[PDB]
């Protein structure tokens, strides 16, 4: 009768129930509305960073942290981050946001990624004052840099168009210092959600006084930890529509948008959006570095096994940092 009793790994691992401490989509994320002018709009809403995420547009991936196009240029020339402001808000520095913040007392003490999170969701140059909707960002350890994004679509990549601006999420080389941060994103994400990788384990259930495999897992070939968690990313937990380019607008339409809400409601149609995930999906990975098998799986894990052949790896969790200790 009480077969789950007794887990030791209870509170450690709370933090890789997803559906629970996350709650949304992690390679698209859209997990809530947002009403602007009358008019609802998706936007991201998972309440844990996903280290290493980018969008790739147009087989470029050095592209969507440069400011969107206005007026004279093209559309495909810009990114998806806030274009310049006056005063300029984005992107801005670790200490330009701490020295933003300094009379708020909670703000200005915040971690880098939740005040990142917090500014994006406090700057809206359209001037919707009573509105919900707030912007994602992109903070950049590289050069501690917060991003706020203006466009929050992720993916356009479908077998009918892709004259159309055409993009979508992934996990690369070039992304590896990046976090894509959602509205939602809580200030104890460093207790409450994945990061590193763990090393030297393997994710089980917890069964009657053990810690027991997986049952079933997908085994998918990959040469090393890097592309076993690009391909666990690739699988998990999404809140994209199937049938997404039938709904999209005419694209002339979409470049007259781009010269200054139709920005916002360009790749995001209301036709599209039943699709919410609500944090669901093959968002965890056993890598077998001997064997080179990224071993996915859609059950949340209640257990580590000690085995040295492996590394665990989450969707959300940073594709190349390792805890070593264990
Ligand atoms: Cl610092
Ligand atoms: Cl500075």
């Not at 039943?274 to 257990?303: A, D, L």
Request: glycine share 6%; aromatic share 12%; proline share 6%.
């Amino acid at each position: 009768e009480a077969e789950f009793m007794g887990n030791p790994w209870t509170e450690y691992m709370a933090k890789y129930d997803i559906e629970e401490v996350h709650g949304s989509g992690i390679r698209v994320d859209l997990g809530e509305d947002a009403e602007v002018a009358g008019t609802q709009y998706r936007l991201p809403s998972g309440k844990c960073p996903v280290f290493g995420k980018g969008i790739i547009i147009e087989n470029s991936k050095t592209t969507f942290l440069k400011p969107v196009a206005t007026g004279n240029q093209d559309l495909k020339d810009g990114g998806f981050a806030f274009p310049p402001t006056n005063p300029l808000i984005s992107p801005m520095t670790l200490n330009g946001m701490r020295d933003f913040y300094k009379n708020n007392e909670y703000v200005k003490n915040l971690d880098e990624l939740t005040l990142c999170s917090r500014h994006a969701g406090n700057m809206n140059p359209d001037n919707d004052k009573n509105s919900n909707y707030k912007y994602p960002a992109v903070y950049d350890y590289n050069d501690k840099k917060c991003h706020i994004l203006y466009i929050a679509a992720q993916e356009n990549n479908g077998p009918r168009y892709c004259s159309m601006f055409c993009f979508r999420p992934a996990k690369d080389k070039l992304f590896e210092n990046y976090v894509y941060l959602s509205k939602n994103v809580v200030d104890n994400w460093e207790e409450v959600c994945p990061r590193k990788n763990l090393e030297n384990a393997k994710f089980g259930l917890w069964v009657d006084g053990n810690c027991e495999d997986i049952p079933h897992v997908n085994e998918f070939s990959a040469n090393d930890l890097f592309e076993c968690n690009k391909l666990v990313f690739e699988l998990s937990a999404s809140d994209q529509p199937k049938q997404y380019e039938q709904h999209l607008t005419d694209y002339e339409k979409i470049k007259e948008g781009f010269k200054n809400d139709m920005i916002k409601s360009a790749f995001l149609p209301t036709g599209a959006f039943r699709y919410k995930s609500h944090g669901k999906g093959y968002n965890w990975g056993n890598y077998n570095r001997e064997t080179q098998k990224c071993e996915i799986f859609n059950v949340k894990p209640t257990c580590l096994i000690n085995d040295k052949s492996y590394i665990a790896t989450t969707a959300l969790s940073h594709p190349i940092e390792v805890e070593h200790n264990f």
